[PDB]
Structure 1
Amino acid sequence: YDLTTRIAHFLDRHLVFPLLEFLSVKEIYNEKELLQGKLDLLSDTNMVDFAMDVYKNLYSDDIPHALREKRTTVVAQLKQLQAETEPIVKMFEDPETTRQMQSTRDGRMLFDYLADKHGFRQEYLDTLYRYAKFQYECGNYSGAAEYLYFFRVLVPATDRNALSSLWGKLASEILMQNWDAAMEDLTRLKETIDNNSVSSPLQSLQQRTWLIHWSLFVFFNHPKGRDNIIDLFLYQPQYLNAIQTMCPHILRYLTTAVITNKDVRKRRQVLKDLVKVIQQESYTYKDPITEFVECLYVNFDFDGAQKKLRECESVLVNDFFLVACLEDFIENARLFIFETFCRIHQCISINMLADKLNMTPEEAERWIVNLIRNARLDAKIDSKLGHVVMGNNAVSPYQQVIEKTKSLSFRSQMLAMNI
């Protein structure tokens, strides 16, 4: 990877406006926590994904974070400080902060439709200038961004504000928990990272991580947007060689849509590059739940693999995100590791298939009835023993070399007979 020479001296020194913190001393499910925090560096005060830490277990420590983000949904952050009933008594700032915003919004809501009804390229941009100010004063006000960044988008600060207000609008619509106006800013982020900038990695790997955040929580077709989140930027999945490869769960939604939403042919491209080499190896050293997906599969295990999937599948479902590819990756971990066993093998006891993958034998029997009908396992089924015989071994492969030495050489010598 080429931009690593910029990373070779910098080594993961990102630049965000909401800086660090994630929800001190914890009890349960700890591999998600730094994972949540290193993205909460880069994802600008989520808005439910603070309380996504809280859905596994309640803490009083979700309070000190979004209290100090009074731009975003002012009154609900007034409610969170009293949700712990804390005398923080300086909450007299957000009503001071909103009052300048109301004088800037409604003082220019007059101008907001002078921007539209005139469409005067000064007076639009004159309104847009004070709303370049105001949508960076508050972009939360994301509907005030949504009216703003639907017309001629480019504010009089086309690079710093028009990113951080549109990434702000990508944040703040998701911070208002909108997704279609975030699908506006899906496109407005994925092109702004594509222009891009000066493209320092401290900007770029942040902007690469900015791609990861909205695509992490699936609402709409991120099973198509997995290809947007793999096959962009020289398709490293973590986008950060940058030894803390912390765009971390991306393999799971990637190998979701391979096995679920695609076929698995085309999972060989996943196992070779997107599992092994450097970045996912780092995330193999980060989450053991993704590890038993891959490391017992790369051992081609048949009993330890299927159950340590199934044990980690009980923790794959513990991905308490807005997820929408949760049991897809879980079920098609079973369905592909059975495809892993019966790929090359000789037989299986249906009673063993029942007891290994914890099903009943008729469920085990009728599943190869489906696996012939899907033509994923081409075999026969012994109807009465409960022993699917799968004996694919070929004899005399000669006829194919023979076919292509006499369809070519016999028929290209035909062509030399016209002179």
Structure 2
Amino acid sequence: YDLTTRIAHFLDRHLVFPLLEFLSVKEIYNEKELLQGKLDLLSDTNMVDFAMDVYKNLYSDDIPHALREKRTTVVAQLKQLQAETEPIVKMFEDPETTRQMQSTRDGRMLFDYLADKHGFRQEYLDTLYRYAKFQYECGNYSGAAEYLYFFRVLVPATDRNALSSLWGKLASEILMQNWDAAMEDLTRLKETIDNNSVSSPLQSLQQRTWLIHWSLFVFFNHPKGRDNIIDLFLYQPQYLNAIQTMCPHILRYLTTAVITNKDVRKRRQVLKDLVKVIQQESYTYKDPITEFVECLYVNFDFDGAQKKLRECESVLVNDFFLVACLEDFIENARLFIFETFCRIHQCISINMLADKLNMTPEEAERWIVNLIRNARLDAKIDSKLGHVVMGNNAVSPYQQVIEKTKSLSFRSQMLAMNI
């Protein structure tokens, strides 16, 4: 692929502001912890997710990172460190810097209202340029940045400053929880990547990763963002080669967002073109919980598979990542493996499903009746042995061939009989 040869010389030399260091010596579910570390570096420090990281397993070392930025909210980081009792004696930058920033906002704010009121085209651009330095320097001041970016955005060096501003507004208001602003810049970012800029190797890759970071976590209508991201740049499960790929996780959410919002016909293409392409072949042997879902599905097992998927449910229900639709994923994973299994089956005992998944046999019967009720399974149910029996053995293919061969030719001869 073109853009892949662009990657091939470079070899994971990505430009990230945290450099390389993330929260060390982590215990539970190491693939999830490793994923959190590559994501923290590629999102330029998350922040919010540090609390989530500590909630699943007790770690002290967010303090670590959390002490070293001030523009989240100076008072919040200072309260976080003094709750811990970190005895820094290095908190002297902020009263000087914030006092310069206060004078800078008010001595911009007077011009803010004049430039709006006068409406003069040079004055508004000069006031915007005089603003642009300040909001780059501190966006905490978040609503001040949003007011500035509501109108013009663009300053004389357009591409870099506009694109960094869209990433910064999207990142800030995802952290602050202002979803409408985040939804606006998810939309504004995917519009902005067309033209593009110089598109020097790493820039295009960072843009792909930023699209993954806003799409990933699920607030409102993220299945539409799933549709927009996959056919954008043409269908990949990770969107980078050069062996080190591990984002890792997006295919899990993507598969569920196909299953609960679309027909599964349709998962035949996902199996070839996302699962068996070499980017996922690289990812699969870095995530055995993802591997069990795909490897059990493609080999069609009946009773190693169902136990291992139930074993995987136990880890997945203890995933503290944002995803919204958690039991929706798990329940349609149970349905989709059963639906896949039943495609060519002769029989299934109602009890033998029930023992296996740890459910009662009546609950299992009513669940199978719900497959039939939705037309996800042709069947008869034996009332007195308690077994569901399938029978789609279609005797006589000849007629539906006969339909087509003589409908076209005979009517074509009738068309001929008129000149």
Higher normalized helix content (fraction of residues): 2
Residue-by-residue CA offset, 1:288-310 (whole Å, 9 max, x unaligned) = 11111111111111212222112
Contact 2:104 2:134 in 1 (8 A): yes
Q: Is the 8 A contact 1:125 1:156 kept in 2?
A: no
Deviations 1:287-344 (A, max 9, x none): 2111111111111112122221121122222321222032222111111000011111
Residue 166 of structure 1, CA deviation = 1.9
Does the 8 A contact of 2:292 with 2:309 survive in 1? yes
Runs (4+) of structure 1 exceeding 4 A deviation are: none
Report how far residue 347 of structure 1 moved. 0.6
Helix, strand or coil at the partner of 1:27: coil
1:153-182 CA distance string (max 9 Å, x none): 223332222222220111111222222111
- Cα 1:375/1:325, change in 2 over 3 Å: same
Contact 2:22–2:37 at 8 Å: present in 1 too? yes
| Closer/same/farther in 2, CA of residues 18 and 99 from structure 1, 3 Å limit | farther
Q: Please give the per-residue CA displacement for 1:339-365, whole angstroms capped at 9, x wherever unaligned.
A: 011111001000101112221111111
How far residue 80 of structure 1 moved from its aligned partner, in angstroms, is 2.1
What TM-score do you get using the length of structure 2 for normalisation? 0.96
2:401 aligns to what SS in structure 1?
Answer: helix
Give ranges in structure 2 of 5+ residues lacking alignment. none
Q: Which residue of 2 aligns with 1:239?
A: 239
Deviation at 1:104, TM superposition (A): 2.2
User: Residue 94 and residue 282 in structure 1: after superposition, are their counterparts in 2 closer, same or farther (change >3 A)?
Assistant: farther
Tell whether the 8 Å contact from 1:241 to 1:279 is kept in structure 2 after alignment: yes
Q: Aligned to 1:348, what secondary structure does the other structure show?
A: strand
Is 2:254 aligned against 1:258? no
1:90 Cα offset (Å): 0.9
Question: 1:73–1:118: structure 2 CA closer, same or farther, 3 Å change rule?
Answer: same
Does the Cα contact within 8 Å between 2:351 and 2:361 map onto a contact in 1?
yes
* Aligned positions, number: 419
1:319–1:326 Cα contact (<8 Å) kept? no
**Cα gap change, 1:231/1:315 in structure 2, threshold over 3 Å: closer, same or farther?**
farther
Tell me if the contact between 2:253 and 2:323 (Cα under 8 Å) persists in the aligned partners. Answer: no
Distance (whole Å) between structure 2 residues aligned to residue 212 and residue 97 of structure 1: 34
Structural mapping, 1:18-417, within 5 Å: 18-417=18-417
Q: Against the structure 1 CA distance between its residues 85 and 129, is the aligned structure 2 distance closer, same or farther, given a 3 Å change threshold?
A: same
Structure 1: stretches of 5+ with no match in the other structure = none
In 2, Cα distance between equivalents of 1:304 and 1:151? 58
Task: Give the distance between the partners of 1:156 and 1:188, measured in 2 at CA.
Answer: 20
Q: CA deviation at 1:270?
A: 1.2
SS in 2 for 1:198: coil
CA separation of 1:205/1:273 partners in 2, compared to 1, >3 Å: closer, same or farther?
same
The range that moved more, 143-152 or 196-205, is: 196-205
**C-alpha displacement of 1:96:** 2.8
Q: CA RMSD in A?
A: 1.6
Which deviates further from its counterpart, 96-105 or 339-348? 96-105
Larger mean Cα displacement after TM superposition, 374-383 or 91-100? 91-100
Partners of 1:18 and 1:98 in 2: CA distance: 23
Contact 1:129 1:155 in 2 (8 A): yes
Question: SS at 2:348's partner residue?
Answer: strand
Counterpart CA distance in 1 for 2:111 and 2:44 is: 29
> Cα distance, 1:116 vs. partner?
2.6
